[PDB]
């Protein structure tokens, strides 16, 4: 009852057998904007199927010497589907997300991941190492795309903050003895009712192994990690020509 789950939104559908319960980020569901909070006068558009469905990004690999990854949302979908081809036309954007993660393994493998959702995860460089040299992170590390970007110093999450306290955010684990997936639902987290989808990046998904993968020879070494996600309650406003960036 708590293990088996199904997720049907749009034309698409997900099944899973060895799962856990579902999480709702910060204790509430997505929503469309109120006429009181809102400020813009133009009538939005709300497709409700062509955008609110499961998109599948890219399939990583989990070796024994792996460190971690992150993805920025909603940057991941700005070149993918009728979602992306609306977000280029319009200027204002609002949405939620459901986020599903896959990693399977047998009953001889062992490991644990941490699947967390952090709003406004600014990236910070190392200041040249000495501390004095001021630097800034390039464009391909702040909006790396759908292909993700790998961490170098995961103990501080590349921002001077520990990973030991990342559970205060909406988190889940993937202990390969117990489960094989993590489902997280998130509302729209921002101070402003609408905001751009290309410049601003509202939150970042992280996937960091704590206990490393391990097995014995004769067993399958390739242990992929796949990332699936779906917009929800998507609105758009400010129509004009398409802007890549």
């Amino acid at each position: 009852s708590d293990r088996v789950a199904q997720l049907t939104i749009g034309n698409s559908t997900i099944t899973t057998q060895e799962a856990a319960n579902i999480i709702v980020g910060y204790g509430e569901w997505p929503s469309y904007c109120s006429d009181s909070d809102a400020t813009a006068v133009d009538k939005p558009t709300r497709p409700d199927v062509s955008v609110n469905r499961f998109y599948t990004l890219d399939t990583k690999l989990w070796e024994k010497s792996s460190k971690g990854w992150y993805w920025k949302f909603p940057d991941v979908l700005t070149e993918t589907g009728v979602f992306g081809q609306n977000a280029q036309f319009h200027y204002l954007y609002r949405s939620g997300f459901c986020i599903h993660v896959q990693c399977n393994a047998s009953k001889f493998h062992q490991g644990a991941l941490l699947v967390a959702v952090l709003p406004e995860y600014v990236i910070g460089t190392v200041a040249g190492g000495t501390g004095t040299e001021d630097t800034h992170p390039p464009y391909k590390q702040t909006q790396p795309g759908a292909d993700g970007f790998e961490l170098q110093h995961p103990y501080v999450l590349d921002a001077g903050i520990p990973i030991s306290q990342l559970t205060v955010c909406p988190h889940q684990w993937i202990n390969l003895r117990t489960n094989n997936c993590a489902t997280i639902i998130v509302p729209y987290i921002n101070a402003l009712p609408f905001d751009s989808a290309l410049n601003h990046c509202n939150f970042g998904l992280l996937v960091v192994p704590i206990s490393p993968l391990d097995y014995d020879q004769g067993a399958t070494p390739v242990i992929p990690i796949t990332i699936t996600l779906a917009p929800m309650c998507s609105e758009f406003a400010g129509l004009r020509q398409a802007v890549t960036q």
């Binding site: 708590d2 088996v4 789950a5 199904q6 997720l7 559908t13 579902i22």
Partner: protein, 50 residues
């Protein structure tokens, strides 16, 4: 005289065909109803056992 009990409770002499099913009309194909999205556990029609 059927004075024993295993003869009274006996299933012998049953000219009836126990039918689990029963026919129904269908002059037209089935009308597809409306649905919306669901994000629940337990409920899982896709997973069958053949």
């Amino acid at each position: 005289g059927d004075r024993v009990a295993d003869v009274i409770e006996s299933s012998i002499g049953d000219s009836v065909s126990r039918a689990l099913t029963h026919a129904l009309p269908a002059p037209t194909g089935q009308n597809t109803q409306v649905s919306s999205h669901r994000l629940d556990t337990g409920k899982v029609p896709a997973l069958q056992a053949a």
